[PDB]
Design a protein around this ligand. Structure first.
Ligand SMILES: Nc1nc2c(ncn2[C@@H]2O[C@H](COP(=O)(O)OP(=O)(O)O)[C@@H](O)[C@H]2O)c(=O)[nH]1
Ligand SMILES: [Mg+2]
Lengths: 36, 320
């Protein structure tokens, strides 16, 4: 419905590695639980 | 007259869209001056640290222990040092912490099972060059800059003239867009460059996905090339990361992605099989022609050669 395609585009083009793109941020620095 | 050539890059996240854009700048524009390169030192270090952290997090999730129990303190230290490090510089302390972790056999074991989580493809590039990158007198090379990963805020675009054509390359990538925005992106498109990460074929299924990454990509390529609105638009297909695919095909069978694959596990037959899977989705092989190229978006020479061939197609496809 093009609206369906649009949905597919947002879903496909947004997937992928997270927290691995900008400058370092306090959010990417949280300590993994197994290391506490 | 120098007509406008509107190029739209489409494809899943991490398929190489941002990279293709930067290659255009390097190939058909001024590229990056040393002064500009120095500006990327901070993102180079950020990406380097994000990479080692991603692997560390996976070790906890996948329950993979460090080869040496001592590395645990390094991991914690990694997080504190990084959190206090000034953007742009890397202390001998943090450099050592990272070099020791990257060296750990447990860390390497997790790195080698990256198909089970989501690790950016610049991780190894930087992590292996810690000698060069860590040095205080470090100046990012053009290739280093190409490998950087930055914040994608809204639609990205780049201008450049090639063979008397005014190219306008667009990449919506990542930024979730509304139907209106997409329609505007599509209207006027002269050619679509659909990027596919070949190396995504062995990725473990996520909790909320019905089909693997490759088939999701196929589903989208199917809608795009068969959509009547693009009948006249040149559909270029970039089967990217051929270099990573080639390295992987050795250990991870294509049968992971296509359970029905009965061919050999050579780069050649696996790649060909994937080319056919995508191209066969075309429901009008008589009408539309798909222009497929196997690429390595991070290889300027390869991209140059390929974009050169894509241009010849745009020209002649212009029924002239
Ligand atoms: N080895 C290798 N890495 C690639 C290739 N193309 C892209 N990459 C890397 O893979 C990641 C892909 O994401 P990116 O290029 O930002 O594009 P996007 O997310 O699809 O827009 C980047 O970290 C690139 O450096 C390729 O052909 N070979
Ligand atoms: Mg992206």
């Amino acid at each position: 419905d093009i609206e369906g395609l649009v949905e597919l585009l947002n879903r496909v083009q947004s997937s992928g590695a997270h927290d691995q793109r900008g400058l370092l941020r306090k959010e990417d620095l949280v300590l993994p639980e197994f290391l506490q | 007259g120098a007509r406008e050539v509107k190029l739209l890059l489409l494809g899943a996240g991490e398929s190489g869209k941002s990279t293709i854009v930067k290659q255009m700048k390097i190939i058909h524009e001024a590229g990056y001056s040393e002064e500009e390169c120095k500006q990327y030192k901070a993102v180079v270090y950020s990406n380097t640290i994000q990479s080692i952290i991603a692997i560390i997090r996976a070790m906890g999730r996948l329950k993979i222990d460090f080869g040496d129990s001592a590395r645990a303190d390094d991991a914690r230290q990694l997080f504190v040092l990084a959190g206090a490090a000034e953007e742009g510089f890397m202390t001998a302390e943090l450099a050592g912490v990272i070099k020791r972790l990257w060296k750990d056999s447990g860390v390497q074991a997790c790195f080698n099972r990256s198909r089970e989580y989501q690790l950016n493809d610049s991780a190894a590039y930087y992590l292996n060059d810690l000698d060069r990158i860590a040095q205080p007198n470090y100046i990012p090379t053009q290739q280093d800059v190409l490998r950087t990963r930055v914040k994608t805020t809204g639609i990205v675009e780049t201008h450049f003239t090639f063979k008397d054509l005014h190219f306008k390359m667009f990449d919506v990538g990542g930024q979730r867009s509304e139907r209106k925005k997409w329609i505007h992106c599509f209207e006027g498109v002269t050619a679509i460059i659909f990027c596919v990460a070949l190396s995504d074929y062995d990725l473990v299924l996520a909790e909320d996905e019905e089909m693997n990454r490759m088939h999701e990509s196929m589903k989208l390529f199917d809608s795009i090339c068969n959509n009547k609105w693009f009948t006249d638009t040149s559909i270029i297909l970039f089967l990217n990361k051929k270099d990573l695919f080639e390295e992987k095909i050795k250990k991870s069978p294509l049968t992971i992605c296509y359970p029905e694959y009965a061919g050999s596990n050579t780069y050649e037959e696996a790649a060909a099989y994937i080319q056919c899977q995508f191209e066969d989705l075309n429901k009008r092989k008589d009408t539309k022609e798909i222009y497929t190229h196997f690429t390595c978006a991070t290889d300027t020479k390869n991209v140059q050669f390929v974009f050169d061939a894509v241009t010849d197609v745009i020209i002649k496809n212009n029924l002239k």
